[PDB]
């Protein structure tokens, strides 16, 4: 398997637009986070807009939870939360730390 | 003579176990079972002497 990073985003962007129920959105999301890379910000945005279209809020919360496991530092987690600022605000998605604050 | 077809219909319409369906099977199975019992019991009736070291006096 010789797939460049640019080919990775353009293929999973196409794969999030075709998912037609909850099983499909969760199965595609599982395979996207199972490689040796963190998906690009433009892939995360299409995964949030796919869970809105099937009307499921917990799947959109878990997207950012997996993001904080896969990064290497906590400053890589921050820079994602600063790119996807409008989308998390426009759809009304909270963070798991914000929802169950400790 | 040829008796394959005739035995073919006797066998396929019988309720008994496989080794009992032939009309001649009583003559083999009755004496075999009696002989099979003697051939199993008798060696076992000798282990008591073998442990006790008693040898048969064929002399």
């Amino acid at each position: 398997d010789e797939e460049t990073f640019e080919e990775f985003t353009a293929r999973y962007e196409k794969e999030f637009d075709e998912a037609y129920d909850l099983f499909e959105v969760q199965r595609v999301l599982n395979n996207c986070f199972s490689y040796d890379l963190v998906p690009a910000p433009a892939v995360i945005e299409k995964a949030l807009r796919a869970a809105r279209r099937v009307n499921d809020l917990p799947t959109a919360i878990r997207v950012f939870e997996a993001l904080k496991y896969k990064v290497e530092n906590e400053d890589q987690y921050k820079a994602y939360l600063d790119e996807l600022k409008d989308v998390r605000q426009e759809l009304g998605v909270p963070l798991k730390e914000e929802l169950f604050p400790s | 003579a040829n008796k394959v077809i005739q035995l073919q219909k006797i066998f396929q319409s019988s309720t008994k176990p496989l080794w009992w369906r032939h009309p001649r099977s009583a003559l083999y199975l009755y004496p075999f079972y009696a002989i099979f019992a003697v051939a199993v019991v008798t060696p076992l009736l000798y282990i008591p002497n073998a442990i006790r070291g008693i040898k048969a006096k064929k002399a």
């Binding site: 909850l22 999301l29 986070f33 799947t59 | 073998a50 442990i51």
Partner: protein, 534 residues
């Protein structure tokens, strides 16, 4: 009821009889090793009243029961007969009446070996039965005859079963499954069946010729008629080594399934695993005289067998690194089967590295009949093959039986045998390197130290076996309750990270073999319309 279990032609029912007999025999062989370790606790006569023949008799009985009546009827007669037809889609085995005689000869071979120890004085010869110590001058009476007939009956069993395993794999696979698509456990019973087919007939020549010297006035091995004792050792060891691999490879295939399930990853380099299992099964026919390094063979004969023995370390080390590559980057689930598999990787490596030292003929001069050898082969047979037998039972018995077991009781059992096995066998290397011979009931006083330590660990490990006997009782009386309370593990695979709890209930099982897709106790008519794969 009578005709379901005495007339059986079903491969699942026969596999249950095998396991029942296998576990009843490990009781006797463990009791003999406990009597042996009590008499070795201290210098002097301890419990056997100075009867050295009796001590030697119990050592033969210990080895024969553990090998030919526990590990072979359970790893092969049990798991092979139950899981091989289900993993390839077969409706039965080929030759179902052959499959039944290969079990019923083992009860008759036990009432031959047991009555051998009760007649005259028994057979105090070692499990290799070398002549002239085992001929009628040095062993009179019928004890060695009755032990040979017992070995003959286990050879009929393993040979007939091997012919059945080979035909079933080649002829009865299901739609779409080709030989490159077999599960790795099916490959391990298939290759083992070929080693048995090509090594058992040479052992039947050797021990039938020994029976002829004793009773028919023959000189195959008698020195007064021209015969040679060293011929017997060539014939015995040409079966022996292939046997040790007939005992580890089925465990290689079990370890592959367990490690992959509790990592959520497929086996790394699956195709090179079959090539390694075949290379080890082939090189196990070219190395047998490393067991005869000091009997006076030529120096050029000994230099060949050194290099032949060493190169079996290359394919085996490929399987060790391959197993560590599948658990790397995994999602590890530490259930009871996974604990044994991780201990197998650590304790089998140690036992195999002490074999590499033994492989050189120059160094084996200080390693002959030395406890050091006893330490080598209890690390690969008792922390090896035995640990893979526990891993198998905890992996498949809930499905096979429909009954769950107490999980936290099983983790206590694992730690008690891991601690106790190490205490028996680790100091055995210290005794051997300092020069303690094997097969002695009594020793000089300087060996008392480590011999006391090993006898303590023998009590720890027997207590762990008695806990396993209770776990079987609890599973059979309380197995249905173990599913509704929180005392057992229900799923060997948990939901994935982003997979919700209710989506997980659509497909509970994510398996790459058929067996976990059947009903819990599998149906007696398991396939009517054949299974199909792409």
């Amino acid at each position: 009821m009578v005709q379901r279990w005495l007339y059986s032609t079903n491969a699942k029912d026969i596999a249950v009889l095998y396991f029942m007999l296998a576990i009843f025999s490990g009781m006797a062989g463990t009791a003999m090793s406990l009597i042996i370790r009590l008499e070795l606790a201290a210098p002097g006569s301890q419990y056997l009243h100075g009867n050295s023949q009796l001590f030697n008799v119990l050592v033969v009985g210990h080895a024969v029961l553990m090998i030919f009546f526990l590990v072979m009827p359970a790893l092969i007669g049990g798991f092979g007969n139950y899981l091989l037809p289900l993993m390839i889609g077969a409706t039965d085995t080929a030759f179902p009446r052959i499959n039944n005689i290969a079990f019923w000869v083992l009860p008759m071979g036990l009432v031959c070996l047991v009555t051998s120890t009760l007649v005259e004085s028994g057979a105090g010869t070692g499990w290799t039965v070398y002549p002239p110590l085992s001929s009628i001058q040095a062993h009179s009476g019928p004890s060695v005859d009755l032990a040979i007939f017992a070995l003959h009956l286990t050879s009929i069993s393993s040979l007939l079963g091997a012919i059945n395993f080979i035909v079933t794999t080649l002829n009865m696979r299901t739609n779409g499954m080709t030989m490159h698509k077999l599960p790795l456990f099916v490959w391990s019973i298939f290759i083992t069946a070929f080693l048995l087919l090509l090594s058992l007939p040479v052992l039947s020549a050797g021990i039938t010729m020994l029976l002829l010297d004793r009773n028919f006035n023959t000189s195959f091995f008698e020195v007064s008629g021209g015969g040679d004792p060293i011929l017997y050792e060539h014939l015995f060891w040409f079966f022996g080594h292939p046997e040790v691999y007939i005992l580890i490879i089925p465990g290689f295939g079990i370890i592959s399934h367990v490690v992959s399930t509790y990592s959520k990853k497929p086996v790394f380099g699956e195709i090179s695993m079959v090539y390694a299992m075949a290379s080890i099964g082939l090189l196990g026919f070219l190395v047998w005289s490393h067991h005869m390094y000091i009997v006076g063979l030529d120096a050029d004969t000994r230099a060949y067998f050194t290099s032949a023995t060493m190169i079996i370390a290359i394919p085996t080390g490929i399987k060790i690194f391959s197993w560590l590559a599948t658990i790397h980057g995994g999602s590890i689930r530490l259930a009871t089967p996974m604990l044994y598999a991780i201990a197998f990787l650590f304790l089998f490596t140690m036992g195999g590295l002490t074999g590499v030292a033994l492989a050189n003929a120059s160094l084996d001069v200080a390693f002959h009949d030395t406890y050091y050898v006893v330490g080598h082969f209890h690390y690969v047979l008792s922390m090896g093959a035995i640990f893979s037998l526990f891993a198998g039972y905890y992996y498949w018995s809930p499905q096979i039986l429909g009954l769950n077991y107490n999980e936290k009781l099983a983790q206590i059992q694992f730690w008690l045998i891991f601690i106790g096995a190490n205490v028996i066998f680790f100091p055995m290397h210290f005794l051997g390197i300092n020069g303690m011979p094997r097969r002695i009931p009594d020793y000089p006083d300087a060996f008392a130290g480590w011999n006391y330590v090993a006898s303590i660990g023998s009590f720890i490990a027997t207590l762990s076996l008695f806990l396993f006997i209770y776990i079987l009782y609890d599973q059979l009386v309380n197995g249905l309750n173990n599913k509704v309370n929180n005392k057992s593990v229900i799923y060997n695979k948990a939901p994935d990270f982003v997979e919700s709890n209710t989506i997980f209930n659509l497909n509970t099982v994510k398996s790459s073999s058929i067996e976990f897709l059947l009903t819990s106790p599998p149906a007696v008519h398991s396939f009517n319309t054949p299974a199909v794969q792409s």
